Design a protein around this ligand. Structure first.
Ligand SMILES: Cc1cc2nc3c(=O)[nH]c(=O)nc-3n(C[C@H](O)[C@H](O)[C@H](O)COP(=O)(O)O)c2cc1C
Ligand SMILES: Cc1cc2nc3c(=O)[nH]c(=O)nc-3n(C[C@H](O)[C@H](O)[C@H](O)COP(=O)(O)O)c2cc1C
Lengths: 204, 204
């Protein structure tokens, strides 16, 4: 590992009852430490044959019960999630040698949430998001580029495109992982059932 | 995107026929760019309920047809792979704004390969990999720490522990993603077919 910052993990010896509280604390410190792109989540979805796929998406919002991300409903992750809502993401912060694993069911939020989040983006991002049909075959790159440039001509916000949506990943289990000392990595694992949240430690 | 390096995607316009050639190119360039931990793979595996789980593992070797990583057979990932070999991993390189998605089936290599790999590791790594039962519940961190300290009393190399193994993820489809210009991300997607590999471009 290449981290130079021994990150406090005071939640290891004393675990909060709710994993959302550790997730907030950790993101707050990542911010202080200048962690480069701490919300880049490596997100796994699963196809109808039990075969996973992965890509980076950004955690756009923290909710009470989960993390939210924006994407296109008809992308590959969107098509997978429509038949199998179970997902898992991992964040890995090289600077502080920390990993966070988030497992749960990701479900599509109301249109209004999507409209709000869409319109929160810098309007410069809207052209390609409308022009591209995410994850479909690109037959002509120049055609796509021209469509987006014509859209960029408006020089302001564009309407949310059909299929632009938000999913919320409702947490069913979470692991917080810290480097520890002597390779004894520190693994704090939380789990949920209709009984609620419990935690335990895992061996590295 | 905090991408401090504008990275060309030389293969995008006229791609090689086999994706492993691109992977090797991309990994070699990543090292020369100074990408930090370019082999930290966010690896997804899938339980018997179709629910994915993720974590980081390091690509220990490039095989002829895939990527090799070391782990423990009775870890969560290893229990999951034993019942469903289909797996997916993403590399994300913040500095050059590149991602590589690797999809395939992961199969365990012979003991000889795992022994060689195990023996190539810095010997300080041996104690904990033997003393810990990866991803089992940790009963008592002091006791685990004592056992690894005890093992370390021997000058390594120490013997490979039962269950320490290498998996090779044999590629079935690969995506190379680059940031491109004007948000028109450059996605090159390879799929293993009849007579071997084909590729196409995907929309961002
Ligand atoms: C740093 C970074 C952030 C990204 N964030 C998102 C995002 O939040 N939402 C999104 O749909 N795609 C995002 N992408 C693009 C995805 O990685 C992927 O290319 C696209 O969603 C299509 O994924 P799919 O074909 O597996 O569904 C991001 C890519 C990078 C490298
Ligand atoms: C950057 C880094 C590299 C890692 N490399 C490996 C590795 O190569 N093999 C391994 O078994 N665990 C590796 N780990 C630990 C894994 O993330 C994980 O905690 C462990 O394998 C148990 O995963 P599981 O419970 O999901 O099976 C690495 C962790 C970090 C953060």
């Amino acid at each position: 590992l290449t981290g130079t910052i021994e990150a406090p993990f005071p939640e290891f010896e004393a675990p909060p009852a709710n994993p959302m509280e550790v997730l907030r604390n950790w993101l707050e410190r990542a911010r202080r430490y200048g962690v480069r792109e701490p919300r880049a989540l490596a997100l796994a979805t699963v196809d109808g044959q039990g075969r996973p796929s992965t890509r980076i998406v950004v955690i756009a919002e923290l909710g009470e019960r989960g993390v939210v991300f924006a994407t296109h409903a008809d992308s590959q992750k969107g098509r997978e999630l429509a038949q199998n809502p179970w997902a898992s993401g991992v964040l890995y912060w090289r600077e502080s040698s920390q990993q966070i694993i988030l497992n749960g069911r990701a479900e599509r939020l109301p249109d209004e949430r999507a409209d709000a989040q869409w319109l929160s983006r810098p309007y410069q991002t809207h052209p390609m998001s409308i022009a591209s049909r995410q994850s479909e075959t690109l037959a002509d790159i120049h055609a796509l580029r021209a469509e987006a440039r014509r859209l960029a001509e408006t020089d302001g916000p564009l309407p949310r495109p059909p299929g632009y949506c938000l999913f919320e990943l409702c947490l069913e289990s979470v692991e917080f992982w810290g480097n520890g000392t002597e390779r004894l990595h520190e693994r704090l694992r939380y789990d949920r059932d209709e009984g609620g949240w419990k935690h335990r430690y895992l061996q590295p």
